């Protein structure tokens, strides 16, 4: 966390997630990476990687786009227990995808970190059903 990493690393970190498997927790908070990074990290999250339960990704200067990416992995993730994606630039538009993924019984997530994300009341109608 809090380092200066970016997307090229996220390619390398995605390869690391694919090869370690025994890795159970990762903190990338406060690292200014963006969305492409989330795309590559997701192809990592979905290969020999059910064991990953927690992921810290706050303040990574992430736009809403990444939400399309976070949905698909969570749409297939086996044992992702906690997610911390707050304080990034997702917005109510971004979470509109983040609520679609949560309808399935396969969603083994337990916690959700959305503090200071900039969301408004319009997004509550969605997560209420979630």
Interface residues toward its own copies, by CB under 8 A:
7-8, 11, 36, 39-40
Give min distance, CB of 16 to its own copies, in A. 15
Residue 5 or 36: which CB sits closer to its own copies? 36
The least distance separating its own copies from the CB of residue 70, rounded to whole angstroms, comes to: 17
Min CB(120)–its own copies separation in Å: 23
Nearer to its own copies, 17 or 40 (CB): 40
3-class secondary structure per residue, the chain:
CCCCCCHHHHHHHHHHHHHHCCCCEEECCCCCCCHHHHHHHHHHHCCCCCCCCEEECCCCCCCCCHHHHHHHHHHHCCCCCEEECCCCCCHHHHHHHHHHHHHCCCCCCCCCECCCCCCCHHHHHHHHHC
């Amino acid at each position: 966390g809090r380092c200066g990493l970016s997307h090229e690393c996220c390619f390398d970190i995605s390869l690391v997630l694919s090869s370690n498997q025994k890795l159970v927790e990762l903190d990338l908070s406060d690292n200014a990476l963006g969305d492409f990074g989330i795309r590559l990290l997701c192809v990592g999250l979905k290969h020999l990687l059910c064991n990953l339960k927690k992921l810290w990704l706050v303040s990574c200067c992430l736009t809403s786009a990444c939400c399309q990416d976070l949905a698909s992995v969570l749409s297939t993730s086996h044992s992702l227990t906690r997610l911390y994606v707050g304080e990034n630039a997702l917005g109510d538009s971004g979470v509109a995808i983040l609520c679609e993924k949560a309808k399935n019984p396969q969603c083994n997530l337990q916690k959700l970190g959305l503090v200071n994300s900039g969301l408004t009341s319009v997004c509550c109608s969605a997560l209420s059903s979630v």
